[model samples]
Target: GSADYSSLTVVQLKDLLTKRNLSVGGLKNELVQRLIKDDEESKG
Candidate 1:
């Protein structure tokens, strides 16, 4: 699914995160980097 983050309002983002069980407060740059690393490894 393609999520259009550019067009998502704060409320919409929050709702989407909630639905996906994502931690809004814990979504820091470091965590993002770790997640990206895992994603790349999975693709490999």
Candidate 2:
């Protein structure tokens, strides 16, 4: 099952972003979008 990025907290998003060296400043939705995009890009 896939994780629900939309339901993640800002802190959780920051942790993921930090690991990837991505900027952590932005709305939760933006973080979710970025993460989803990154995941897709990595798989492709």
Candidate 3:
């Protein structure tokens, strides 16, 4: 299942990014996009 990003805190989001080796800066939307992009790449 997908995460409830709307209710997640910045620290929580950063943790996700860190797990994926992605940058933890920028807005929440950017973080979400990065995660989605990584997910898609991994699936292909």
Instruction: For each candidate, give its TM-score against the true structure.
Output: 0.41, 0.66, 0.53
lDDT of 3 by residue, 1-44 (tens): 65644435677767877876875566877766666666567774
User: Which candidate comes out best when scored by lDDT?
Assistant: 2
Ten consecutive residues with minimal summed lDDT in candidate 2?
1-10
Better of 2 and 3 by TM-score: 2
How far is 24's C-alpha from truth in model 2 (Å)? 3.6
Q: Sorted by lDDT, highest first, which candidate order results?
A: 2, 3, 1
TM-score of 3: 0.53
The pairs that clash in candidate 3 are none
1-44, model 1: which lDDT tens digit per residue? 75343335455555555665653343444344434443346564
**Global Cα RMSD, each model:** 5.9, 2.1, 2.9
lDDT scores of the candidates, listed in order? 0.47, 0.73, 0.65
Off by over 4 Å in 2: 1-6
For model 2 the local lDDT of residue 43 reads 77
Residue 19, candidate 3: alpha-carbon lDDT: 77
